[PDB]
Design a protein around this ligand. Structure first.
Ligand SMILES: [Ca+2]
Ligand SMILES: [Ca+2]
Ligand SMILES: [Ca+2]
Ligand SMILES: [Ca+2]
Ligand SMILES: [Ca+2]
Ligand SMILES: [Ca+2]
Ligand SMILES: [Cl-]
Ligand SMILES: [Cl-]
Ligand code: NA
Ligand code: NA
Ligand code: NA
Lengths: 174, 165
């Protein structure tokens, strides 16, 4: 009542995606590819309304025209999309970046990327398995630094592996 | 062909292909045939690496042996249901690869015989090749895809059919 805030869940997630850790971003992409239309219905409807040229992708102009036809945080998102390979955000990546914890933060949902990452099925993501998510396990000191930084942040018990409880906690954060 | 990238949706896509509407299945088959090396290289590298007998087809044992070589009752179901190179490609390509205007315009234009921008019932009949069930299935497909109710499928409706899950 009076002057209030009805914040956009879709925009909050969209601006937060880039800054999420690299494991969470891939887990969110896997989740987005597995959720059915009933679970992402609001995001699908918005994407269709914005995708005026039916390209299956959104440009910065389509997103900008939507904030008009229908802040520094949203302006940075537009510049981040302009800077990527195609100058666009594909449907799947848009869903990954906009899906909310209310939808994804559930054991049944997070088990989808977790089981995929856990190659041997021992309930833990080893350093080798973790490296295999991002690139070839044969080829770099920058890769080792990124893995070490990812492990510090996620491997709470410091046993050099990622269990399901640690995976759920990381998925909830930020 | 030695180093490959396995997607989280490869097996799920293989299983769900038969369940897709018939126009989407043909559109994916046409798309699979046109996608450039860079787009299909990886899926081709998986197929070849799994095709141990050089028959240009994949057996139930071949797929299971591959997953084992790398390191799911849904996977066992598709396994019980050969698979040629083109059909494997059509059934494994993800939206990030096929859901692009330039890619989807290829089957759309092939289906749009008169080039008017819409796929008609008569164009649908030609795609699918006396039986009342054919005309019924075409009508049930048209009503699911024809969002504006004009009796025809435009590109917007075709793109929405292509992204639907
Ligand atoms: Ca677009
Ligand atoms: Ca493991
Ligand atoms: Ca741990
Ligand atoms: Ca074979
Ligand atoms: Ca036509
Ligand atoms: Ca129509
Ligand atoms: Cl269009
Ligand atoms: Cl059908
Ligand atoms: Na990271
Ligand atoms: Na659904
Ligand atoms: Na259209």
């Amino acid at each position: 009542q009076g002057h209030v805030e009805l914040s956009s869940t879709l925009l909050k997630n969209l601006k937060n995606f880039k800054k999420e850790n690299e494991l969470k971003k891939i887990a969110l992409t896997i989740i987005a590819k597995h959720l059915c239309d009933v679970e992402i219905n609001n995001l699908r409807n918005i994407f269709i309304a914005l995708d005026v040229d039916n390209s299956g992708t959104l440009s910065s102009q389509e997103i900008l025209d939507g904030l008009k036809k229908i802040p520094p945080d949203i302006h940075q998102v537009l510049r981040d999309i302009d800077s990527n390979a195609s100058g666009q955000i594909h449907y799947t990546d848009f869903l990954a970046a906009t899906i909310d914890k209310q939808t994804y933060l559930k054991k049944e949902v997070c088990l989808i990327p977790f089981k995929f990452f856990d190659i041997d099925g021992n309930g833990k993501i080893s350093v080798e398995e973790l490296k295999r998510i991002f690139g070839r396990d044969d080829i770099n000191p920058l890769i080792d630094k990124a893995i070490d930084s990812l492990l510090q942040e996620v491997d709470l018990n410091g046993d050099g592996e990622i269990d399901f409880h640690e995976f759920m906690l990381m998925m909830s954060k930020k």
